[PDB]
Design a protein around this ligand. Sequence first.
Ligand SMILES: [Mg+2]
Ligand SMILES: [Zn+2]
Lengths: 197, 79, 145, 50, 302, 225, 148, 100, 41, 79
Amino acid sequence: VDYSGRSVITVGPYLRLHQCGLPKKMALELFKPFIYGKLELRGLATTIKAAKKMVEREEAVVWDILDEVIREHPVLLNRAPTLHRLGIQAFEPVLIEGKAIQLHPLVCAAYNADFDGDQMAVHVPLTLEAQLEARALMMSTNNILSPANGEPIIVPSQDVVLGLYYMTRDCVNAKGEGMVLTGPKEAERLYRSGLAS
Amino acid sequence: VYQGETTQTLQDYLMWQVELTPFSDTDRAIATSIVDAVDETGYLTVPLEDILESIGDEEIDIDEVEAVLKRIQRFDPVG
Amino acid sequence: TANSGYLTRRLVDVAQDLVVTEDDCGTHEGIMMTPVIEGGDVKEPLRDRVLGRVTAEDVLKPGTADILVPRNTLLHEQWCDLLEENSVDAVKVRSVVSCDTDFGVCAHCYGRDLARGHIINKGEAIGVIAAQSIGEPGTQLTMRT
Amino acid sequence: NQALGKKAISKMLNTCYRILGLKPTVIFADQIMYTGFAYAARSGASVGID
Amino acid sequence: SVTEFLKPRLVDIEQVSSTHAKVTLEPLERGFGHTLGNALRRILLSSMPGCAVTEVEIDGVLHEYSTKEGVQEDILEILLNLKGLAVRVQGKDEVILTLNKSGIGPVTAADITHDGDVEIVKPQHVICHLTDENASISMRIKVQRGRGYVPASTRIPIGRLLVDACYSPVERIAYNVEAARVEQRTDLDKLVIEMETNGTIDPEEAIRRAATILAEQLEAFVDLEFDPILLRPVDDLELTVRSANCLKAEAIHYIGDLVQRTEVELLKTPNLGKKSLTEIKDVLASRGLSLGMRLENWPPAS
Amino acid sequence: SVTEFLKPRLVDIEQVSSTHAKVTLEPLERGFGHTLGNALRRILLSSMPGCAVTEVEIDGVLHEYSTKEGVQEDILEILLNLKGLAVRVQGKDEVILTLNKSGIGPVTAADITHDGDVEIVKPQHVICHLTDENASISMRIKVQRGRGYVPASTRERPIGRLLVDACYSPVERIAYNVEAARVEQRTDLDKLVIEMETNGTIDPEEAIRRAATILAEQLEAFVDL
Amino acid sequence: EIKELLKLGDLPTSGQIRLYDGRTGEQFERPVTVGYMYMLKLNHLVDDKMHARSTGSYSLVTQQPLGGKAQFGGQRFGEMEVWALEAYGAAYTLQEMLTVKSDDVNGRTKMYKNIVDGNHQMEPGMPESFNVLLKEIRSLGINIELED
Amino acid sequence: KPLVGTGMERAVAVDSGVTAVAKRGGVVQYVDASRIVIKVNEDEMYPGEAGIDIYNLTKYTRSNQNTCINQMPCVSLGEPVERGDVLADGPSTDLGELAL
Amino acid sequence: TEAAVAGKRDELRGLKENVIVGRLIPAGTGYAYHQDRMRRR
Amino acid sequence: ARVTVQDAVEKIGNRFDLVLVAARRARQMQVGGKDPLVPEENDKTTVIALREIEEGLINNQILDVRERQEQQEQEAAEL
Ligand SMILES: [Mg+2]
Ligand SMILES: [Zn+2]
């Protein structure tokens, strides 16, 4: 198919559950006719060859055009083999530098993916119906239960579990033990000041 | 097995530019006729009267053909 | 891996054309659900076998003739708790096997979506979902003896 | 108010989804991931031969 | 230059409440978000002048773990309530207040004896509750001035109960660094600071005071559009007299206005036929232009 | 009072070596030692200015993937050696140095032709080796001032001009400690000691003052707000 | 022996030291294993992995996008991806994949023109590979045809 | 070099053909980034022969995987060498040891 | 061979058949389209 | 912006019907001359349609009534 790409996946820990990290070099190629239309629409280019040359030269304004056109436009990420329907999911792109795709950690279990060489493919919905199907059916925030058995599929693991387990533990004789606090905010204020464990 | 690959010629590029230009239906037909009669070196091989005859509509004068030809001559490559 | 892929391809091919094309077929047939017990251990309790299904007949209390669960009831968590309160050991539910709908199934003989908490909608390709649900865990099984 | 393992965190998410809904659940999941990452980094957990 | 650094240009302020605020600063040089945020957080938490309740004395209570009769709350509950009391002092560095209450109902901060120097931020702050009618509560409260948080355990006569001192007006502060870019440079910081105070001062004043303290600490080392053709007048086109007259009658003065007009509309224009339309299309085609062009917001206030 | 803080100042500077120094700040309030130390460490590691080699031109070479007769090193190794040349420029933001050498022996940084506004801080820095008596090397080296790290790929050039990635930071490493000071009759005052390891092309005191100036100019935005 | 060699060089025997956070200056709460490893760079470079395409060249027989980064080809949307789209119910996304981004020649050029004009609508049409299949079946002496 | 190894690095480096290994003992008469000339000892020379060994090093050539093959000298002018000694290092070799 | 000898006819009622000819599958968002086709057919 | 469509799904009752209604309204706002019924805040027509559905201003019956009213007005004013 057309309007498709692929590359290696890295981890984005800052992302939200509905967001992905898309390289802007990939997005410039994947969204080329949209960029042509947006360039012609605002008078930057009066013909199609002018817009083509502007995109080829990669001027400073085509990046603003790209950030305008990719604003709310889902992309489908797919990892092979697609053993179930959770192997394809829709995300909102965030333009990043580099050549690797950033993936939200919480969706790595559904894809059965790890960050040691895995590659993922990205597809661009074109029509309004396809975009609304991506937003309303295939979006990650819509897929939190397993269709096979009804169990959740956004289970935290590894570093998140280790950190939450470590913070919610008690020691017999720790610094700051036995004092009475007005609330959680005072607890955090004591912790950040080094006055309580 | 062997299948091959499609190649883009001068006429394919010109028709691609015609599709993305705000022509009317009559103007688009005239542009198709004009691009058909363009050789490999980029020159028009027939007079405009032949194009007007090939259009097949009798309410079109030579001025519209001239205007569409002028628009096409500014495509890439220029000339 | 190849054997799992071949199995799931065959499963998809056999059931690809099954879609929810109705809401109720009016059938009274069903399957009797009892706890799965092997030897001396209860492998599966009754709650997980009747959750999210539709009763094919009225459920009566074990000690009386009083109707406990009426017909055509989607057994959610509250109904399962009520059933376990009165020590119910067998519930007649509706299954896609005993469905009178021609060229597809109805939303009552199927039950819950299992991806959404509500009943299944018309137009859902349940055959593909079933084939992918069966075939996906095939790489967690074994091939060699 | 307990030591939160994998099962306890999954139970917390399931309780949030059952009581409140979808949007609070996704916000809660993102916040849980952020806090877990931050405090796993702060702990300094390592592995040694001893 | 080499000594020239980026400065914030998009300062956003979101007032969640009268004491809760959210500030955003961007763009910043790479890594300066963490530097500024950590320095400001440390200063706002640890070293910040203010006034707080230090110790208390209750007439009927001589031990920290005692049971008061007629008061619903425990002694440590009253200590928790007093720890949250926000007081402004202008006179001196130590004041003594007396609270006396009788009857039934919520004993609050409005019952504290009034003084010119001492100001209570929240008069409705609940101190305790009196259940029975024949019970009275009398206490003496000491308020001092200091910096930051001082636990009572670090300060370890009779009837003197110690209270953890929270002089700093800041109740909570957090910061977060996100990615931001100028057109060219893409690895820039965006600093977001969410902070809540105790009501004595505004969050913005707290940030300004922290920044002023940090700056004063350094005083001994610091040394002092559209394509141009669309903007051209329609007179640039060598049009005939009749076509130009029709265009001026249609209030078309710029090339963009002409190229935004379809052929169907121009056909129905009075005094305009098909020859003039063809001539207009010809003169537009000589410059690589057509009539079915769409523009988003054409007139650029010029 | 309690709203009045004691201002620190530079007390002692100890030049342990030509590229290693200790700077002492005293007195400090409680908690300000770490607050100043971490900010100063980050600014010193990230934002200091210095001079670096950016372009080279050797007489007989056309690219860095070649060799030269009588020279035991490849052109890539020579460029990597030049990448570590420490130069202090005192009059301009860009200078060109000339190196001419002949005969068997090590070509070091002391063979660069002397310039009035240019100082070489490590004359023993070996650039290459000539292994033949009838062998000579002549080269032109451009040195520019900047800050940070600029790879040559990001930044017409004739054939034979070789680009070098520029690391302008003169600071190698920073460490700091907070200790207890004896000032007046107070026992709650701290002292901040900063150990700086550099390449020798920047003075410690001016580096500290530059970091403080950068911090104050960044704080002036929060001061007004 | 490793601990003896650590003692020779004046290093902690446990092999763990106290580290500090470079962003806050705060000491991590537990000692961290710090040492030296031998790392390798493998011949799997993302430079050779990243590839994207909007349009390009097609096959002569099937009229579908070619394959491979060197040919500037497209990504294959196989049977399992089709099953995944069928399980979602995304009928328009699937029909868009099957015709307009593929061997449907006229819809390919209509969709590009619509996108450049700001109209996100398609006219699907018939794939070319189905016509190829019909011709190949007819070449075997079997009469297969579309009706109505 | 690995700095933590097993002792098999030299065998892999030498038994592979990536390095330049002295065929006869002698003295390094000439050393350069692209060639080495060894003056063979009088007791290892054949009658009626000028005893020198010339090794021309492989410089920046392409491998089957489109990588670089390049040899660099590891000996200095006038130093003694013996039979089997390493004169130049091939790719991923440090002083005659494998360095990956 | 069986279909050619029997002279069979295909009504295109399943998912795979509509995928082959590049139509909307009679499931999901394409269910109403096929319902309207049945109504008007 | 949009992160979830649950409210619109509960407003319509189906995801499959929600997609169709939202596509109809978005195409009205994109190619047609329609104006949004909610204040557009740097949004695309799909998100605007979803927000209109979420507030109960758009559904199948409303769209059909609007189409019939517009057609009747056009036919009445044509003469
Ligand atoms: Mg892997
Ligand atoms: Zn049924």
